[PDB]
Each structure stands twice: as C-alpha cells, then as structure tokens.
Amino acid sequence: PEMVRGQVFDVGPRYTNLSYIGEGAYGMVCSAYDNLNKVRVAIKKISPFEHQTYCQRTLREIKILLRFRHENIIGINDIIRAPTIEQMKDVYIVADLMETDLYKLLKTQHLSNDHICYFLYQILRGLKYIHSANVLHRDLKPSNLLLNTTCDLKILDFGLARVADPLTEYVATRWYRAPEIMLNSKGYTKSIDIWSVGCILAEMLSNRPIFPGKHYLDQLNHILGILGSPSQEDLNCIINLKARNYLLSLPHKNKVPWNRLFPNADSKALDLLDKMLTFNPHKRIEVEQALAHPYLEQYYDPSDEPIAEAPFKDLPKEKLKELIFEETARFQPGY
Numbered sequence: 001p002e003m004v005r006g007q008v009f010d011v012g013p014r015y016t017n018l019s020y021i022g023e024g025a026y027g028m029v030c031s032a033y034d035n036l037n038k039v040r041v042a043i044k045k046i047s048p049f050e051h052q053t054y055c056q057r058t059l060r061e062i063k064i065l066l067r068f069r070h071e072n073i074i075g076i077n078d079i080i081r082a083p084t085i086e087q088m089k090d091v092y093i094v095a096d097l098m099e100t101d102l103y104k105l106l107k108t109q110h111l112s113n114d115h116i117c118y119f120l121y122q123i124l125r126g127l128k129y130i131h132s133a134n135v136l137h138r139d140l141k142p143s144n145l146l147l148n149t150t151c152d153l154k155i156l157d158f159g160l161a162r163v164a165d166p167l168t169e170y171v172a173t174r175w176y177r178a179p180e181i182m183l184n185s186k187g188y189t190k191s192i193d194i195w196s197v198g199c200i201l202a203e204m205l206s207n208r209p210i211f212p213g214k215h216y217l218d219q220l221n222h223i224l225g226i227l228g229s230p231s232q233e234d235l236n237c238i239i240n241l242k243a244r245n246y247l248l249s250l251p252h253k254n255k256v257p258w259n260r261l262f263p264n265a266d267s268k269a270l271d272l273l274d275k276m277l278t279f280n281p282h283k284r285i286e287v288e289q290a291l292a293h294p295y296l297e298q299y300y301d302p303s304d305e306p307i308a309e310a311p312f313k314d315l316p317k318e319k320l321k322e323l324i325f326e327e328t329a330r331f332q333p334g335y
C-alpha cells in the first residue's frame, strides 16, 4: 500500500511513514518509523531474483551484515521477506537511520583539521574490521559515509547504482577508484580500499574531489599530474601489459608535492595522505599502519579497535534464492 516513487514497500504494519532517500539498479532506500522499537529507520528494498549477479550481491550483502557488528559500520536491525520462497520476490533490509553523510556535509562546510582527523580515524577503524574479516568494501566514497550530529561516522554500502545516462548523490562515480582498477581486470586487493580513503581525505582537505574527469584517461592524467610519472618500478607493478604500454606512452609529468596542493593542511595529514595515494599498491599503507600514523595519535587505541572474530574465506540465481531464503530465516516470526 505505501508506494514511493513507483515502488511499493510491503513493510507495514511494523514500519510505516516511508520517505524517499534514493534508488539503485535493483532496489530503493526509504526512511521509515519502527513501531515495535520506536525508532527512525532506513529500509533497503531490493528485487534481485531475476538476475544472477544481483542475487550474488544480495547474498554477499546479507552474509556480511549478519556477521558484522561494529560502531563504525551500519548495522542490521531486521530482514523482511515473504513466509514462502515462491512468494518471496523482494527483500527489505532494515538499519538505523543516520541524519546525514559526508557527501552532504562537504557541500556546506570546509572541514576543520580536527573534524578531518576524527572522521578519518573512524573510517580507518571501521575498515580495519572489514579488512580483518578478509572482506573488501570496493566502493568507498563520501556518499558511503554516514554521520550524525555528534560526528559519529558509519561505513555504508548503498549498493549498485542506477544506469547513468550518457551531479546527484548515489550515482556510480569512478573518482575514488584505484589506478590498478582503471589499468587491470581484477587482481584487486585491500589496497584499493586504502586508495579510496586517500581520495576521501584529499577531498576533506579541499573543496572538491581530487581526481575527477569524464573518462579513466582524464583521471589517470590528473593522477599522474600530481604523483608524477610512474617510476620504472611502478610500471612493473602494472600487471596488464596493454595498460603498462599505454602509461609508458605518456609525456613525463613531474611530481607536485602535497603541501603545494594543500598549503594549509596539517603536515602529518599530508604525510598520511601521501602513503595512501601511492601508485604501487604493494607500497600503499595498510589499514593498521594507517591507524598507527602520527596524524591519528589523539584517537589511536588498538585495544579498542576490534577485529572480526569470524573472517570469511558460479551458482544459478534459483540456487542463490534458496541460500538467501535460508540466511533470512532467523528474522521470521516463527523462529
């Protein structure tokens, strides 16, 4: 009965008063009220079952969210789906509503060094847990960082974005992607997530994304314009030879030091930024090393930076539906 921008949300009576937040390739997110627990929530409706890849992404989302519990990662409240597998065509994942996000905050505010520092700390604390579980986030960016009024930050994965027709918040954007993704089909690592954080830190230090551009080649040109042309050593770390020939073909660009781009930035912040935005993924700083960096010394406390107790280590969509039915069973009434 409640319908929001053409999507029915079969979610009452417990949850009511829906309001649109955004949509993606196969689902939609609204705010809503929880009457059982008397709290504002967010609810992600997804309809993945006709397509194999959406089913894979959905199973992965569910398994991760069941296992994960961390103060800097969005947490699951409930999963609503039909009592019968044949009847189940939509799944709704419920989590607590956060007031705002970094993407919105960056539009209205130049952030102080103190705020940058605390936000970066929480990003890294949350990411330490994700990475300790041997999970890759793969799409860190400001729209995927929730905030509230007291500067608490929570990592999100909003999910696969809507077709972009060749400016708004939930589009797929490439600005935070590591160069090895641009340059290679997947041999991807934790390191890509650290590059993304580097890009987010650079953006906090300024008023704009550091590596924009319409195509990969425009971005790579911006990247090379700041980092300088790759050393021979860096060229050798590029595994796809077609891509390595191409960088090899470009004019030499000199390195622009970070303190020339951000003349007013904290020098410790810039030292950490440099270590995150390193072209060679093997030399890129790892999440635990980043937490221990002098920039974060006000907050660093490994005894209070949890690791996951339960690390992770082909299928037809119909089979993936079964698996999804099983994983959601715990939230059914009769359990």
Ligand SMILES: Cc1ccc(NC(=O)c2cccc(C(F)(F)F)c2)cc1-c1ccc2nc(NC3CC3)ncc2c1
Pocket: 021, 029, 042, 043, 044, 060, 061, 064, 068, 073, 074, 093, 094, 095, 096, 097, 098, 099, 100, 101, 130, 136, 137, 146, 155, 156, 157, 158
């Ligand atoms: C409702 C909901 C359900 C599921 C998810 N899923 C995840 O965040 C997710 C999925 C896969 C992996 C991971 C992660 F990060 F690796 F742990 C997270 C997010 C949400 C979600 C989406 C948007 C939200 N927006 C807000 N606030 C609006 C920005 C103002 N608050 C809570 C939200 C919560």
